Amino acid sequence: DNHLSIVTLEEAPFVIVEDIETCVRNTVPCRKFVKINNSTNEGMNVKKCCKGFCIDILKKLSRTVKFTYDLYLVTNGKHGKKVNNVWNGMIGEVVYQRAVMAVGSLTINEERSEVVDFSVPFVETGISVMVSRGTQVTGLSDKKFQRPHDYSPPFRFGTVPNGSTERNIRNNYPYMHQYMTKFNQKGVEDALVSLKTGKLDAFIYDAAVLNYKAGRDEGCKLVTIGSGYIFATTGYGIALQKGSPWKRQIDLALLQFVGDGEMEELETLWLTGIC
Amino acid sequence: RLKIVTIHQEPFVYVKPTLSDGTCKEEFTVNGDPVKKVICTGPNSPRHTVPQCCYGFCIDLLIKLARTMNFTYEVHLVADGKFGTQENKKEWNGMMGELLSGQADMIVAPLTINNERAQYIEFSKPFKYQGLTILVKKGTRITGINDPRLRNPSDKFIYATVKQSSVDIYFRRQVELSTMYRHMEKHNYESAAEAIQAVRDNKLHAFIWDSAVLEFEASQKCDLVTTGELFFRSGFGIGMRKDSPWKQNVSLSILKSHENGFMEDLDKTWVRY
Ligand SMILES: Cc1nc(C(=O)NCc2cccnc2)cnc1OCS(=O)(=O)c1cccc(Cl)c1
Ligand SMILES: N[C@@H](CCC(=O)O)C(=O)O
């Protein structure tokens, strides 16, 4: 009743997962359902530990709004995608009432707000483009992105599919999206290696994550275009069930956190970069 | 028909007198398109209301929300020219007071989302992401929010903000800024335009205000510069009463406009050129 089921997903530096049998220091306990094999539905919850920027936000919210929680990591998808009118990922966990809320690098967009409630944004994000330093790309609407076959050889660029970034590209730039799919990257780290090794000219992804990776790139060779420009500005938000009685208190707490300068310490704790 | 309240705040809300025939002059944007204008009433002390002409970023956003959600509207300027602050009993002034008293059904203005206001009204998702910065006369050398002339102030360097604004509460509520707040309380200005003019005429040496406003002023008036980046992030939101039936579709339309480039076009039309 006052003990809430909360789902999360690992994406450094906002949610970081570690092994353990008692979580220590700034980490909180988070469980992950791990299957026995692929011929059964059997599995077991592995006790792990979670930390990061969004975990510190959850620790603050738990202290301020006064609630306890059982945190667990999503295993059915990632952030959230509507497949055959059925939501998976963290959104799906909230939509189908397996979790009271979702905390992490979860992007607020319109189609998700139709099925879940979002708190006020607390981490500014959107769509950015990471390239090797010096690449001439004006933005998302650059002709190398819009009309990629007007160039020989064509520009090579991709994203990590099934997230809010691909969803936006699929609706806004049809030709760009269908050309992009052959450059889909399994994850951020694969995309970074694809960039540095010359297999990829540009990587389009969540703004806050690319901002963090740019500041920590070895030699500071990978940069975001426009000096950290963001298309379709939005933010990470706490997802809640529609009509959740927790939303108002979560919003007031988040606005009170930023209003009293408490965000700066979490920023210097998790988000700083040398570059 | 919704009663819209707003406030003079370029480049978000321009305010010009009507023509002799009670109409607004036909003007054109930076891209050759016609500038959409609406008639807005407001005072020019007693407050004699006169029809005037409104246009800008927020007016374009208001027109989009009206066509998208199918509602009619009448626009008027806030009577006391203030954004909104809660000052035995407490009382809201400015656009906040007009929204809660029923004088307005919706606030369409560069209205900062803070904990104080969200306790009484409903904010949409932010339609503009910006922050706080400092405007100074070109040649004035201060590092930023942590400059000694600001943290250990005297009468040799005057800085202030707008009275009864979100920035005014910002320095009042944070005890870490108490030194700065007691310096500004004696010099806060009634409007941003007056404070900006005071920096031009070297009557005010630093203006702490919204970055989307101050950076636009520095782009059009080259004797003014902004020092440092943003020492604080803030955002503007549509303001409605908590029982409004339009609040969910308003917020969804804000997200849609962000995600299809409409908010970016407005930023190109009104902010960055
Ligand atoms: C809750 C809240 N957090 C912040 C804030 O600075 N968060 C920390 C942070 C760290 C790194 C990157 N981005 C943000 C600001 N304002 C807030 O509430 C006001 S708002 O209008 O919703 C809003 C305006 C602008 C940005 C955002 Cl994220 C939200
Ligand atoms: N943060 C994104 C995932 C990464 C991306 O799509 O850029 C989401 O919530 O869907």
Side-chain angles (χ1 to χ4, degrees), chain A residues 108-110 113 118-119 121 124 168 172 229 231-235 242 252 255-256 258-261 267, chain B residues 113-115 118-119 125-126 129-130 170 173-174 232-233 248 252 255-256 258-261 264 268 272:
Chain A
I108 297 166
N109 63 23
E110 182 189 16
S113 304
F118 274 110
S119 70
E124 209 185 306
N168 183 276
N172 287 328
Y229 190 82
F231 177 78
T233 59
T234 178
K242 302 193 74 57
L252 290 176
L255 305 184
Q256 183 252 279
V258 60
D260 303 330
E267 256 169 81
Chain B
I113 307 169
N114 60 26
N115 169 278
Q119 215 161 305
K125 287 291 186 290
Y129 287 87
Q130 53 136 37
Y170 174 87
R173 89 175 146 269
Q174 285 177 101
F232 188 67
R233 294 187 194 83
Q248 165 73 330
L252 290 173
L255 303 179
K256 182 180 181 64
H258 275 303
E259 294 163 39
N260 61 23
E264 193 156 87
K268 280 129 198 314
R272 297 161 333 202

Side-chain angles (χ1 to χ4, degrees), chain A residues 4 10 15 23 44 60 85 93 96 115 117 137 182 190 197-198 212 247 249 251 266 272-273:
Chain A
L4 311 191
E10 175 171 26
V15 178
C23 295
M44 274 166 62
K60 278 172 154 288
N85 218 14
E93 293 301 308
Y96 304 101
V115 292
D117 274 350
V137 168
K182 58 178 158 296
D190 283 5
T197 57
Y212 169 79
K247 173 185 160 57
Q249 281 182 272
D251 284 343
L266 300 187
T272 58

Side-chain angles (χ1 to χ4, degrees), chain A residues 79 105-107 112 163-165 205-206 236:
Chain A
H79 301 75
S105 52
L106 192 67
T107 296
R112 287 167 181 183
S164 68
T165 292
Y205 194 70
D206 175 79
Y236 296 165

Side-chain angles (χ1 to χ4, degrees), chain A residues 32-46 48-86:
Chain A
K32 181 171 68 167
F33 189 79
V34 177
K35 309 174 64 223
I36 302 299
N37 62 72
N38 302 326
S39 312
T40 168
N41 298 313
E42 235 190 344
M44 274 166 62
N45 299 313
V46 181
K48 316 207 69 180
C49 305
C50 281
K51 67 180 182 181
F53 185 96
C54 293
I55 301 305
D56 282 0
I57 290 284
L58 173 55
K59 278 195 282 180
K60 278 172 154 288
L61 291 171
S62 168
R63 150 122 199 161
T64 292
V65 195
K66 295 202 282 288
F67 61 87
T68 63
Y69 56 89
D70 276 338
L71 187 62
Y72 75 103
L73 295 146
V74 64
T75 55
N76 175 46
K78 300 232 294 188
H79 301 75
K81 182 187 179 183
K82 190 165 72 172
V83 187
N84 297 309
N85 218 14
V86 175

Side-chain angles (χ1 to χ4, degrees), chain A residues 131-135 137-217 219-220 222-257:
Chain A
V131 298
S132 190
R133 178 175 244 104
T135 303
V137 168
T138 73
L140 220 56
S141 266
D142 195 292
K143 266 39 182 64
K144 281 182 270 252
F145 287 143
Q146 306 282 310
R147 306 180 53 95
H149 273 130
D150 291 1
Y151 299 82
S152 288
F155 216 50
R156 302 164 308 162
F157 55 95
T159 187
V160 180
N162 306 331
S164 68
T165 292
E166 187 192 23
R167 186 57 182 151
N168 183 276
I169 299 181
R170 179 186 299 271
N171 295 154
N172 287 328
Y173 316 109
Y175 190 88
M176 173 179 176
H177 169 78
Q178 67 89 36
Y179 170 88
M180 213 165 50
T181 60
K182 58 178 158 296
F183 301 117
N184 278 349
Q185 307 288 299
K186 245 40 171 153
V188 169
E189 319 285 324
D190 283 5
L192 302 181
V193 167
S194 299
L195 277 177
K196 289 185 130 179
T197 57
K199 324 214 209 63
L200 202 57
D201 301 312
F203 176 44
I204 307 159
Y205 194 70
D206 175 79
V209 166
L210 289 190
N211 191 294
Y212 169 79
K213 293 291 185 166
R216 277 182 134 79
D217 185 63
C220 307
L222 306 183
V223 300
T224 54
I225 57 157
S227 191
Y229 190 82
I230 297 172
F231 177 78
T233 59
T234 178
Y236 296 165
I238 313 288
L240 309 95
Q241 302 173 15
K242 302 193 74 57
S244 176
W246 297 104
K247 173 185 160 57
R248 165 185 74 80
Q249 281 182 272
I250 293 297
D251 284 343
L252 290 176
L254 289 178
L255 305 184
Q256 183 252 279
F257 296 161

